[PDB]
Symmetry: C3
Subunit: 284 residues, 3 copies
């Protein structure tokens, strides 16, 4: 049933270290349609999940499932190609293990993107939101990704999340957007985690507006919590597919096809942005 | 462990088709104490769940468990006699399969009733509420009925719920209430799904009032989401057992005995109402 | 998989009755660092959980796990030394069984303490809060401790929680605080149940403030609901470790070390308080 413990994560890391010969400092997890950066991986090594000891089985959902290692912007990185989402039914242990493997591989910074709905009236389709905090409905409701025995080797029983979204990384991301004159697309905000897989209902959207949420999505918070637990710094950026409040007012529906079209519209800019961020990251 | 997939649903539908010789266009799921309509089933065929391949086992909870087919108001219908509720511990797969069997049987419209608590100050015991939207706390909290692999043959990975409660069906229900001069009992509103089985606490009721909820109950939203996913139109009506906000202000308790007494008070009127709705439904 | 049913609870109670020769009227469950009262147990009998038929296995988490019986303040009591929390991954059945064993042993009143975060601006580190109601996010989200088959021998399918926190017991606790001149430390309030194990995020804290929550913690509500279901009266007291709203405004982190330091600061006073409450409890 593979628990995301020290022994099991170590066995996966040992396999990866041997096969790739890359020691990554940075990890990357991408939103759907936002995977182009993994094409710029120089000296790349592709490792199917299915080959890695103790990695989660992903064949029921299918589609791509690779760990990709190599160099971006002069830095060594490890990327997940084929993301695990909790609405697919993956367990807490299955979500946690690949991030803890990143930790054992030497990852100190995790960069994450996702697609999400805009709740704040200021947000438009195609905007970026630097996530500065979250409202974790699964966590409040006994489905926190850390429910279960604590793995002491990685972190504490009761983590504090007040610094889960690194302030310096947010400031660096904004700086680079300003230098390249697309800062008008960049916002900061609070992310509500909707477990999914149904989109927020119109009345759910309205409730989230009342509760001080700026953005809503079905991902990212579980990964953030596992990273924070084991001391990995996180930058999380949402690409806004739509404004759910406006759509509710106008009786307009959300669909994944529209979402992917927005991802295609911004994928190249997001790639350029994150490549520069990687280049500008501290060597420490 | 029977997954609610295409193959398993097909095997159940094939058994039912053979035994009943009825091709239903309408499905019906009833609230507790609101099952009288299933007595007007003409040319009826009763099929115990326990006889149907792949139907959920319900013997731990016990009580009645039949699929009933036949004719109401000149239309062919299929009804669940003995409802599956998620607070009993049924899985996502167990809730989903009977609705997907309805889909394969040919159901295009699902009519659902339930008993619920009033939050909106305008609501009194014995009132009806046409549900026009919902706040799905289990869904926000990673217990959405669709969590797990998607069954592509039935619907999309990410459904939009903005039209989950059919507007035309709401308007028809209200029209019939007006013709029979009981429209003063009929409201529209937003339904909060409390997983249950404890009634909303007084402070939970107060919170729901702040969040724009009109009614709260422990059912119906899972069925609505499975129906919406596979393209079945839904009319959902709550019978109000009590006003939870007033009861909290007056330190008055809710109990199931009082709830069933309200169901008995309105069961015959609800039967007449729904029979007329069935008669007036489009042939398409 | 041991269900918390009548037969299984009876087997545990029969073992305990034989080994201890104590018939307790009062049960006690303590917050972390607040276990000193279990040192004043006169004529004490210590029974490891691992020896009791059908008790939950707790070796993965480890640490102490004893049932302690004996006399406090002239009354016969049973205490849990080593508390089961749902964020550890224990099931509904594992949480419920020890409280139902208390019921079969003859417990009529359950006294519970916990450590929690202050949301209400009036609350300071070291304050006590008499819990008068709750917001149960796991319950709203389909993780209520009673989800599953109902055990009819203990209580009803649909409990009402409006009297879950006994008013007379709250008044008695306050009276004793007044007599001993520490009533300035004592508040009353509404408790939000955060499943855990991560502390409330700063934005979650802000949301809880908007929703009328006074205190937030990761315990106690499951035990309250099982006790209420089987007719045991409850007094629940939170010791405030910090004010989460102030900490968010000042960018100050919460950690368990700080929490335990507050418990140490108030443990002796809480012991004296609860011993007096036990002495003053009705003989009925």
């Amino acid at each position: 049933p593979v628990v995301a413990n020290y022994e099991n994560a170590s066995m996966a890391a040992d396999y990866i270290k041997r096969v790739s010969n890359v020691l990554p400092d940075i990890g990357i997890i991408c939103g759907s349609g936002l995977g182009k950066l993994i094409e710029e991986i120089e000296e790349r090594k592709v490792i199917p999940y299915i080959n890695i000891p103790n990695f989660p089985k992903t064949t029921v959902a299918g589609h791509v499932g690779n760990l990709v290692l190599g160099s971006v912007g002069g830095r060594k990185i490890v990327a997940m190609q084929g993301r695990l989402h909790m609405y697919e039914g993956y367990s807490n242990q299955e979500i946690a293990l690949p991030i803890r493997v990143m930790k054992l591989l030497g990852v100190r910074v995790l960069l994450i993107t996702n697609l999400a709905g805009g709740i704040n009236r200021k947000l438009k389709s195609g905007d970026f939101v630097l996530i500065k905090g979250h409202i974790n409905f699964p966590g409040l409701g006994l489905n926190n990704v850390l429910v279960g025995p604590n793995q002491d080797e990685f972190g504490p029983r009761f983590p504090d999340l007040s610094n889960a979204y690194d302030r310096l990384l947010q400031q660096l991301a904004l700086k680079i957007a300003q230098e390249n004159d697309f800062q008008d697309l960049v916002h900061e905000g609070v992310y509500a985690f909707n477990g999914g897989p149904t989109y927020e209902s119109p009345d759910e959207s309205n409730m989230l507006l009342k509760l001080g949420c700026d953005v809503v999505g079905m991902s990212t918070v579980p990964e953030v919590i596992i990273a924070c637990h084991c001391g990995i710094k996180v930058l999380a950026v949402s690409l806004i597919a739509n404004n759910s409040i406006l759509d509710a007012e106008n009786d307009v529906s959300i669909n994944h096809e529209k979402v992917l079209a927005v991802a295609e519209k911004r994928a190249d800019l997001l790639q350029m942005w994150f490549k520069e961020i990687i280049t500008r990251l501290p060597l420490d």
